[PDB]
A paper describes a structure:
Type 4 pili (T4P)—important in bacterial pathogens—are filaments composed of one well-characterized major pilin, and several minor pilins whose roles are often poorly understood.
Protein crystals for PilCSK36 were produced in 0.2 µL sitting drop with a 1:1 protein to mother liquor (0.2 M MgCl26H2O, 20% w/v PEG 3350). After collecting a complete dataset, we solved a 1.60 Å resolution structure. This suggests that these proteins—showing 57% sequence identity —are likely to bind similar glycan ligands.
Author numbering: 83 to 156, 161 to 462
The structure:
């Protein structure tokens, strides 16, 4: 297939980037390609052609159609990845940066190049060592308010020799993990906390995916001003779960917790040690089915000294909560709220916005979560 005179030293890479995920609305990096020994390739009269490729909406593997799943890794049993070129479409004819569109979310982009001899006989397109994943999370003007975002599928593991590789699909938690706030695209967003991640092959989809498994430990994010309005949107996996999935420590005296019970009930627990609110337990008007994935979103906003929290399960409102911020002589200053994930939970993805998402935005995220591993 390949002409005998194409040299073996073609070098293909992404220029000036160490980040291999991008959101819709961003522009990706330029590609770069060339023969290492240019004296040799000129003497053979070889030139190059290059192109960007976008992976298809599904992968054709083992005579079936598999849903694409993200990874930031560079095999045997494990993740199913698109093959170049059968699972890609060529989208450009050069190395110039690609403007990432909404229609590219949840796909791979890869840059490839080939040698061509002076008779016009082409070699095979060759990619560099690293593909780009286009984040599945819808943007549509939301990205200026995305403050935290972690997709468990993008977690990696750090080996003894400090190299970083994919987590093996062995169904057990690993704690030597590389997990980040991916919304942070300028500075280091890798979390310093211990975040156990499980990679496993999910039979429902004949494909791997990953789950954060905190096993009742907590991860804490501080200094969130809930007066701006705030929204936490989570996707949890299809296993039985219990405990404090999400806790808002609005104050040293005021906290509000989404607590899962094993029977699928969602308890809403309020603690206020001031006289501003009583506190106690309420139950959301829902029962989770832990044999499916479920999305849980909480949006909060302050209007006229009242903090309203609304809970959306799989897109549906199932609980509204009002908390007095100024009552009976107390004033709760919630400019430095804490957002805590925890419980014996299995978290596939979470996103935090420093605004109250509209009804439309809540539905957009609920549909993304519901279709993340579904046929597209």
């Amino acid at each position: 297939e390949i002409p005998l005179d194409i040299p073996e030293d073609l070098v293909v890479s992404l220029k000036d980037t160490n980040r291999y995920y991008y959101y819709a609305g961003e522009t990706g990096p330029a590609g770069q390609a060339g023969f290492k020994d240019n004296k040799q390739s000129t003497k053979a009269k070889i030139h190059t052609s290059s192109a960007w490729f976008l992976s298809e909406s599904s992968i054709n593997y083992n005579n079936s159609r598999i849903v694409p799943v993200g990874t930031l890794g560079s095999q045997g049993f494990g993740i199913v990845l698109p093959k170049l070129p059968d699972d890609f479409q060529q989208i450009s004819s050069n190395e110039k940066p690609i403007a990432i569109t909404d229609e590219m979310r949840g796909r791979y982009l890869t840059f490839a190049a080939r040698g061509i001899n002076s008779f016009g006989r082409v070699g095979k397109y060759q990619e560099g060592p690293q593909r780009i994943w286009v984040m599945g999370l819808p943007n549509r003007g939301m990205r200026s308010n995305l403050v935290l975002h972690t997709d468990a599928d993008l977690a990696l593991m750090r080996n003894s020799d400090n190299t970083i590789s994919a987590i093996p699909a062995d169904g057990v938690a690993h704690t030597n993990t590389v997990v980040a706030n991916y919304a942070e695209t300028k500075k280091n967003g890798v979390y310093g906390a211990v975040i156990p991640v499980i990679n496993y092959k999910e039979p429902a989809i004949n494909q791997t995916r990953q789950l954060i498994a905190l096993n009742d430990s907590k991860i804490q994010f501080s200094n969130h001003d809930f007066n701006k309005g705030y929204t936490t949107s989570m996707l949890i996996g299809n296993r039985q779960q219990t405990g404090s999935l999400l806790t808002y420590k609005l104050d040293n005296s005021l906290n509000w917790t989404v607590s899962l019970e094993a029977n699928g009930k969602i308890a809403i627990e309020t603690v206020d040690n001031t006289n501003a609110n009583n506190g106690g337990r309420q139950y959301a008007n829902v029962v989770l089915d832990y044999t499916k994935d479920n999305s849980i979103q909480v949006r909060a906003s302050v209007t006229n000294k009242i903090l309203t929290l609304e809970v959306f399960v799989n897109g549906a409102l199932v609980h509204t909560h009002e908390l007095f911020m100024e009552r009976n002589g107390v004033t709760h200053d919630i400019r430095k709220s804490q957002i805590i994930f925890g419980g014996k939970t299995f978290i596939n993805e979470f996103a935090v916005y420093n605004k109250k998402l509209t009804d439309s935005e809540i539905n957009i995220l609920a549909e993304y979560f519901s279709d993340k591993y579904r046929a597209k």
